[PDB]
Amino acid sequence: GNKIHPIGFRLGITRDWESRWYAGKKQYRHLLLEDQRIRGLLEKELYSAGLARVDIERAADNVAVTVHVAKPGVVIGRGGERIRVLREELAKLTGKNVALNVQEVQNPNLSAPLVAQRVAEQIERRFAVRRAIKQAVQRVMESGAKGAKVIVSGRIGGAEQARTEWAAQGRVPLHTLRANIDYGFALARTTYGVLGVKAYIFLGEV
Amino acid sequence: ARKALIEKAKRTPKFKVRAYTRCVRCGRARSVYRFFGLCRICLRELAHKGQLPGVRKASW
Amino acid sequence: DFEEKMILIRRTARMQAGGRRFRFGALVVVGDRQGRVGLGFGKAPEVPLAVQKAGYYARRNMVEVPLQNGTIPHEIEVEFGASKIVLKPAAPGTGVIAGAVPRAILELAGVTDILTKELGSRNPINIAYATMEALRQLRTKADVERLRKGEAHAQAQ
RNA sequence: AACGCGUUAAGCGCGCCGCCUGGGGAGUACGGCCGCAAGGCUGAAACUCAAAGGAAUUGACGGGGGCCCGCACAAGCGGUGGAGCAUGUGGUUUAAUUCGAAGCAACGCGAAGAACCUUACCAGGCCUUGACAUGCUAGGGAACCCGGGUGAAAGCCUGGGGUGCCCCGCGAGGGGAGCCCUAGCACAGGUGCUGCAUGGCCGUCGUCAGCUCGUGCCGUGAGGUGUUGGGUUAAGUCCCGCAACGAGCGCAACCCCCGCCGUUAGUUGCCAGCGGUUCGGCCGGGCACUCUAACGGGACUGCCCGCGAAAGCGGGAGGAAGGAGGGGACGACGUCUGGUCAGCAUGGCCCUUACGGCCUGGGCGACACACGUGCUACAAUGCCCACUACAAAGCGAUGCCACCCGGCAACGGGGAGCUAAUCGCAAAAAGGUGGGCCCAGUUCGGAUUGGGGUCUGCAACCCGACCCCAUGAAGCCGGAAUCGCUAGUAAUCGCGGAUCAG
Ligand SMILES: C[NH+](C)c1cc(NC(=O)CNC(C)(C)C)c(O)c2c1C[C@H]1C[C@H]3[C@H]([NH+](C)C)C(O)=C(C(N)=O)C(=O)[C@@]3(O)C(O)=C1C2=O
Ligand SMILES: [Mg+2]
Ligand SMILES: [Mg+2]
Ligand SMILES: [Mg+2]
Ligand SMILES: [Mg+2]
Ligand SMILES: [Mg+2]
Ligand SMILES: [Mg+2]
Ligand SMILES: [Mg+2]
Ligand SMILES: [Mg+2]
Ligand SMILES: [Mg+2]
Ligand SMILES: [Mg+2]
Ligand SMILES: [Mg+2]
Ligand SMILES: [Mg+2]
Ligand SMILES: [Mg+2]
Ligand SMILES: [Mg+2]
Ligand SMILES: [Mg+2]
Ligand SMILES: [Mg+2]
Ligand SMILES: [Mg+2]
Ligand SMILES: [Mg+2]
Ligand SMILES: [Mg+2]
Numbered sequence: 033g034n035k036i037h038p039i040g041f042r043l044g045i046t047r048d049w050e051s052r053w054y055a056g057k058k059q060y061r062h063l064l065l066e067d068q069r070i071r072g073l074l075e076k077e078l079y080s081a082g083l084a085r086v087d088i089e090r091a092a093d094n095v096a097v098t099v100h101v102a103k104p105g106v107v108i109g110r111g112g113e114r115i116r117v118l119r120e121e122l123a124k125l126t127g128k129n130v131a132l133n134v135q136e137v138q139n140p141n142l143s144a145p146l147v148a149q150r151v152a153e154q155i156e157r158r159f160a161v162r163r164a165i166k167q168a169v170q171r172v173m174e175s176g177a178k179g180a181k182v183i184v185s186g187r188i189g190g191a192e193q194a195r196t197e198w199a200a201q202g203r204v205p206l207h208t209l210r211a212n213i214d215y216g217f218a219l220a221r222t223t224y225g226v227l228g229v230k231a232y233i234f235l236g237e238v
Numbered sequence: 239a240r241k242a243l244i245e246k247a248k249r250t251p252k253f254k255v256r257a258y259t260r261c262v263r264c265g266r267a268r269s270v271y272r273f274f275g276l277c278r279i280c281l282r283e284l285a286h287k288g289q290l291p292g293v294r295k296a297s298w
Numbered sequence: 299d300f301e302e303k304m305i306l307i308r309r310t311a312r313m314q315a316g317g318r319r320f321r322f323g324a325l326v327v328v329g330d331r332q333g334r335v336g337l338g339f340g341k342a343p344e345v346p347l348a349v350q351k352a353g354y355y356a357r358r359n360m361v362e363v364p365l366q367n368g369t370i371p372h373e374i375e376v377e378f379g380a381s382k383i384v385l386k387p388a389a390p391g392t393g394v395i396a397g398a399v400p401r402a403i404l405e406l407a408g409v410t411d412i413l414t415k416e417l418g419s420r421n422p423i424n425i426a427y428a429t430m431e432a433l434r435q436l437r438t439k440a441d442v443e444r445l446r447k448g449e450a451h452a453q454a455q
Numbered sequence: 456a457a458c459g460c461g462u463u464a465a466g467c468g469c470g471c472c473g474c475c476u477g478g479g480g481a482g483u484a485c486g487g488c489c490g491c492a493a494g495g496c497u498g499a500a501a502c503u504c505a506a507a508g509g510a511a512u513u514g515a516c517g518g519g520g521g522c523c524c525g526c527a528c529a530a531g532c533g534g535u536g537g538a539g540c541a542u543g544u545g546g547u548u549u550a551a552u553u554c555g556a557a558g559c560a561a562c563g564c565g566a567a568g569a570a571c572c573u574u575a576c577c578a579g580g581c582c583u584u585g586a587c588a589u590g591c592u593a594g595g596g597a598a599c600c601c602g603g604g605u606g607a608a609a610g611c612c613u614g615g616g617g618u619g620c621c622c623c624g625c626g627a628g629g630g631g632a633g634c635c636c637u638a639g640c641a642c643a644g645g646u647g648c649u650g651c652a653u654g655g656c657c658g659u660c661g662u663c664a665g666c667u668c669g670u671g672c673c674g675u676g677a678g679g680u681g682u683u684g685g686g687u688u689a690a691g692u693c694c695c696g697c698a699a700c701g702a703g704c705g706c707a708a709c710c711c712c713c714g715c716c717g718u719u720a721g722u723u724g725c726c727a728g729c730g731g732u733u734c735g736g737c738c739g740g741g742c743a744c745u746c747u748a749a750c751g752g753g754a755c756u757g758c759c760c761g762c763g764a765a766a767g768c769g770g771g772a773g774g775a776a777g778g779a780g781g782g783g784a785c786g787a788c789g790u791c792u793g794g795u796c797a798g799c800a801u802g803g804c805c806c807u808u809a810c811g812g813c814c815u816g817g818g819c820g821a822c823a824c825a826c827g828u829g830c831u832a833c834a835a836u837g838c839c840c841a842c843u844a845c846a847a848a849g850c851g852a853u854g855c856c857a858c859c860c861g862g863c864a865a866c867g868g869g870g871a872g873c874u875a876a877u878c879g880c881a882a883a884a885a886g887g888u889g890g891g892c893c894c895a896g897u898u899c900g901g902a903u904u905g906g907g908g909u910c911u912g913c914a915a916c917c918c919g920a921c922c923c924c925a926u927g928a929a930g931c932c933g934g935a936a937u938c939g940c941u942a943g944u945a946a947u948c949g950c951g952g953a954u955c956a957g
């Protein structure tokens with residue numbers, strides 16, 4: 033356990049915070065506590081929609097929950113039917129002005145946490161450990177990314193001896209700040225236990 | 239976090255002295271910042287996702 | 299467009315400070331059963347990356363074969379290492395009698411019938427290009443009286 | 456086989472000789488033969504093992520060498536080990552003194568705040584769909600809110616106030632959702648175990664210059680080459696050479712801090728000139744400079760002599776900065792089955808009227824000892840009482856508390872300002888001026904005690920901090936051993952923040 037999280041490095045250097053407000057000492061404590069309910073319910077449900085990055089910008093007791101997600105019509109339903117069910121179930125938890133939008137994950141391979149998920153799924157899915165990770169990466173320099181890398185990391189394939197694996201390609205340079213890379217932590221669950229997964233993608237130097 | 243022991247600190251107590259905080263996110267009251275309602279493990283873990291606004295990574 | 303069997307794979311060891319490290323190696327054939335046939339030997343970090351690579355070397359390492367009614371033109375023997383390879387034509391109906399590895403290479407190269415033995419050392423890889431060479435060296439009732447005699451050829455024929 | 460052989464063949468063939476036929480037993484036994492003898496020659500088996508071997512490759516290792524670097528040793532400063540106290544820890548003790556950490560890389564470490572709380576521990580009084588989730592069925596109940604009794608508290612027995620919402624209806628009133636109770640069932644919950652079944656995150660060799668792949672080249676191959684040699688570098692940094700050519704993760708740069716300066720800016724900061732001045736940047740006026748944050752500029756071996764194929768190197772000119780200017784974040788493929796199921800996450804074994812739950816009290820602080828970390832000392836380059844200057848950083852409207860009064864004082868009472876460049880913590884301290892002490896167990900030192908008070912808090916006996924008085928212990932600079940630091944560093948002196956009523 034030697035290295036550092038890539039996102040938490042470029043905190044306003046080549047990335048950005050999800051929750052982007054202000055707050056006082058009185059408010060920040062409670063105000064944030066809220067976001068971690070907003071992002072606990074929102075997640076727990078939206079899973080099989082492929083949810084990515086969850087913005088929560090804030091004005092005077094106006095919450096502004098944007099949502100990037102693989103599949104905008106499993107957030108929606110038919111017509112506008114199921115998005116409403118939630119848009120209030122949040123104002124049910126806040127007690128205020130939930131503006132819960134939707135924004136499609138255009139290219140899905142070119143956004144890490146998704147990439148992480150489908151793999152962690154594929155491991156839950158009892159697939160070919162290696163090939164999962166190979167094709168994982170495969171598609172990433174197939175959609176057109178600068179760099180790719182996936183790190184399967186459990187008791188792998190059902191083995192009693194805990195190991196780890198991976199592969200990659202292209203530029204992976206996390207010591208260049210000015211290189212934008214997205215981290216994806218997933219976390220499969222299989223009969224033998226729990227097998228966290230990682231995925232890093234380079235898009236470009238700026 | 240013994241589940242019921244988040245609750246012995248949630249509700250208000252017999253006398254006001256017993257008012258010890260805890261983590262909303264995990265229920266370890268051992269090292270908690272009454273500004274995040276969070277501990278040190280959490281605060282990083284989260285800050286490392288940029289999920290706490292304005293929380294930068296420091297250097298001088 | 300080349301059909302391609304596979305002969306043998308292995309994991310081999312390097313070493314280092316703290317635990318071993320490895321590499322894998324893949325013996326591969328090729329061959330349009332009417333005439334031609336290659337071999338490769340491929341090493342690479344993860345297995346089928348090698349098996350794929352071994353297929354490469356075989357495409358360049360090709361050997362056209364004198365073939366004659368699905369069989370071998372004369373008799374033949376060759377050494378290479380201490381592994382001693384034998385071939386010998388069989389008649390219509392006797393067919394790829396040969397252990398493990400000539401079969402793989404003879405078949406895909408296109409032999410119906412053949413006789414065969416392996417000798418002393420039996421390590422695949424030697425008997426592999428044991429026979430890649432045994433076959434580089436087959437010679438034909440015409441390739442031949444126009445190696446010799448052919449001093450003054452086309453007065454003879 | 457490879458090593459190597461290589462017209463001195465281990466190359467290509469002819470003749471003849473002797474010799475081998477798996478390791479151990481074994482060069483033994485039996486027999487013959489030879490010698491004076493010591494012994495030799497010839498030379499087995501029973502039984503037992505899946506080997507015994509041969510060259511060769513990558514490593515690891517050497518009390519083998521060659522060449523580099525780190526406060527690794529030396530050259531220098533200051534300490535520990537000794538003393539008393541503070542904090543962890545080992546061992547004992549305990550009803551329990553809950554847990555885990557284990558050579559450097561466990562030991563002021565999980566604890567960035569154990570009086571109950573925290574709290575997993577122990578002794579008692581207890582709760583059983585349970586402090587918590589989404590529910591199912593039978594029966595009653597709106598939710599809910601007030602009081603008594605018993606009690607160490609919990610807990611239990613019990614008095615009363617209350618009767619909203621949805622649908623149907625003229626109506627009494629039935630149906631329904633919620634929630635409530637009683638009984639039963641799903642199940643909840645566990646800081647029960649295993650870090651040697653995992654996740655993740657951390658430590659570490661190590662900010663060391665290393666770790667590798669592609670295509671090709673070379674070996675039958677594992678594999679090598681590349682990355683090596685010479686020069687250079689904080690470096691696999693780079694220059695030159697080479698059967699190599701490049702790339703991926705590292706080095707490095709892009710990010711922040713400090714150093715110079717320019718652009719936008721003049722409040723709550725600032726005061727060089729002018730006006731007034733209660734002499735206080737106090738007011739008019741100004742934003743010059745200091746500051747104040749945002750963006751840019753600038754350093755490149757660019758210049759010169761020298762050294763050198765080059766990369767580089769040495770000395771200098773200019774410059775605020777010179778060869779990366781100082782500092783930070785930043786930790787490569789992997790190892791130690793290193794760390795924790797005690798933040799959380801989870802396979803599995805395990806209890807589920809009990810390890811689960813609530814409670815008051817007791818405990819992690821116990822003390823024949825031992826280590827590990829630090830504080831203050833043992834004092835004259837000092838101790839002490841006055842007057843006197845010069846800081847940066849951070850916190851504070853459930854708090855910071857200027858002054859005023861009371862008290863020797865802690866502090867209490869009263870009370871102005873401050874969403875904080877405007878008000879406050881705020882006294883900076885070593886330094887400075889002036890004076891007292893004169894080698895003393897001392898005006899050094901400030902333990903441990905006796906008594907008196909203040910504060911936080913339901914509550915200071917275990918078990919708190921602070922005030923005043925009296926007590927004035929060890930220790931006159933520390934055995935063997937051993938630690939840190941290469942410049943604004945070491946030492947020495949003060950301020951601050953987090954945690955948190957204290
Ligand atoms: C005692 N041995 C047999 C042992 C056993 C286990 N685990 C088991 O037996 C569990 N096996 C099951 C699966 C339950 C059947 C073990 O799990 C271990 C060990 C060894 C220890 C050694 C540890 C040691 N120190 C700290 C006590 C040490 O010096 C090191 C080290 N290399 O520095 C360790 O690795 C050590 O801490 C350690 O990890 C051990 C084990 O893990
Ligand atoms: Mg738990
Ligand atoms: Mg408390
Ligand atoms: Mg031979
Ligand atoms: Mg043999
Ligand atoms: Mg020679
Ligand atoms: Mg034998
Ligand atoms: Mg020394
Ligand atoms: Mg344990
Ligand atoms: Mg207690
Ligand atoms: Mg471990
Ligand atoms: Mg252990
Ligand atoms: Mg272990
Ligand atoms: Mg370095
Ligand atoms: Mg070759
Ligand atoms: Mg080169
Ligand atoms: Mg190397
Ligand atoms: Mg070399
Ligand atoms: Mg390089
Ligand atoms: Mg003004």
Ligand SMILES: [Mg+2]
Nearest residue numbers: 728729730731
């Ligand atoms: Mg004037």
Ligand SMILES: [Mg+2]
Nearest residue numbers: 207208707785
């Ligand atoms: Mg760097």
Ligand SMILES: [Mg+2]
Nearest residue numbers: 557558791793
């Ligand atoms: Mg160890």
Ligand SMILES: [Mg+2]
Nearest residue numbers: 543566819820
């Ligand atoms: Mg303790």
Ligand SMILES: [Mg+2]
Nearest residue numbers: 859860861862
């Ligand atoms: Mg007074």
Ligand SMILES: [Mg+2]
Nearest residue numbers: 856866867868
């Ligand atoms: Mg006061």
Ligand SMILES: [Mg+2]
Nearest residue numbers: 834894899931
């Ligand atoms: Mg003296």
Ligand SMILES: [Mg+2]
Nearest residue numbers: 525526940941
């Ligand atoms: Mg140094």
Ligand SMILES: [Mg+2]
Nearest residue numbers: 949950951952
């Ligand atoms: Mg202090």
Ligand SMILES: [Zn+2]
Nearest residue numbers: 261264277280
């Ligand atoms: Zn926490």
